[model samples]
Target: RATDLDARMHDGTTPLILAARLALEGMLEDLINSHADVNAVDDLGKSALHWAAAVNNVDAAVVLLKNGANKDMQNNKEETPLFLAAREGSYETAKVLLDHFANRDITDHMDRLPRDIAQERMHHDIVRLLD
Candidate 1:
C-alpha cells in the first residue's frame, strides 16, 4: 500500500526512522526490502541510522549498513553516523560503523568530531572505540 511507504512525517522522520528509533527490527527489515531509502534524512539531517544508534539498536544499524546505508552521510546538522553514534553513547553501534569505514574525524555543524562529542558527553566507551 502507498500508505505503507516510508514517507517523512511532519518532523521529517520516516516510518523506517521511527521503526529504528523503536528498535522494530522486523518492520525495519520489511521497509528496507521494500526499497525504503535507508539513508533518507529528516529536516534535522538525521537518518534511520542515527535513530538506530540513538536508541542503541545495534541490530538495526547492522542491517541498515549491510543494505548499503551511507555510513558517512551527514545529517541536517552535518553530523555523520559516527558522530551521532558516539554522542548517543552507542559504543557497539559505533564500533560497527567504524568497522565499516565511517569517518571518525568528520565534524558536525557545531565543529565537534565524533571523538570530541563522545568525550564531551563522558561516553568513555565510545571515545575509546573512536580512538
Candidate 2:
C-alpha cells in the first residue's frame, strides 16, 4: 500500500522524516524497509537524512545513507547533511558522512562552506578534519 505508506503531513513530512527526527533506529529499520524515500523532501526539501544530521543520530544517518540517501543532497537553503552535522558538532556522524563522500567544500545558500562553518562555529575537531 504505497498510498497508505506514502502519506505526508501538511508540512510534507513523511513517516521516514518522523522516524529520523525522533532517532527511532528500531522503527527506522522497519519503515525504511518499507517506504523510506531516503531523498524524499518536504516543500522545504528536508529529508530523513537532513533530520538525522540535525539531531546527530549516527544510526539514523547510517541507515538512510545505506538506503540510498545522497550524501551531498541540499535542501531549500542549500544546506546539506554535512552542514547540519558540523552545526551540531557531531564528530562521529560527520566522520560517517565524510567517509561516504560528503563533499567538504560544498557551499550552502549563504556561500558558507562546511570548513568555514566548522571553524566559525567552534567545531574544532571537524575544522581540522575539513582542513
Candidate 3:
C-alpha cells in the first residue's frame, strides 16, 4: 500500500531512485515488492535502474531487473542503464544488464555506445564484455 513509491522529490528523485543510488538493495527490493514502478524516471529521465548501474550495485540492479525495470531506458542524455554502467566502469552491473538482455547496440545522445564509453574510461574488461 505504498502509494508514494513512485512519487518524486523536489529534485525529481523517487524513493526508489534514492535507495538505488545509495545501494540500499534491501530497501529497493522492498519498494518494488510493494508495487513501485520499476521504470519510473526522475525529472532528468533517470530511473532507479540507472542509479543502480551508476553506483555499480549488482544486487540493486538485479532487484530492479527482477521487478521488470526497463534496462534500455534512455535518460535526458539518452544514457541507458547499460551506458551508465559502462561510463562508471561498472563491470558486474554491466554483465548483469547484458545477462538480462539490455541492448548493447543502443547509442546515447552523444552518439556513444556502451563499449565506446567503456573504452574511453579504460575499462578494458567492460569493453570486452560490450564487444
RMSD of each: 1.6, 1.4, 1.3
Model 1's alpha-carbon lDDT is 0.85
Stretches off by above 4 angstroms in model 3 are none
Better of 2 and 3 by TM-score: 3
TM-score for all predictions? 0.92, 0.92, 0.94
Query: Which candidate leads the pack in lDDT?
Result: 3
Candidate 3, residues 7-97: lDDT per residue as tens digits? 7888799889989999875778778888878888889899999999999999999988887898889999999999999999989999999
Error of 2 at 59 (Å): 0.7
Question: What lDDT score is found at residue 57 in candidate 1?
Answer: 89
For candidate 3, the TM-score is 0.94
Q: Residue 128 error for model 1, in Å?
A: 1.5
Query: On a 0 to 1 TM-score scale, where does candidate 2 land against the true structure?
Result: 0.92
What global local distance difference test value does model 2 have?
0.84
**Which pairs clash (backbone N, Cα, C closer than 3 Å) in model 1?**
45-75, 45-76
The clash number for model 1 is 2
Please, what are the lDDT tens digits per residue for candidate 1 over residues 11-42? 88898888888998698889888888878888
The 10 consecutive residues of candidate 1 with the worst lDDT sum are 1-10
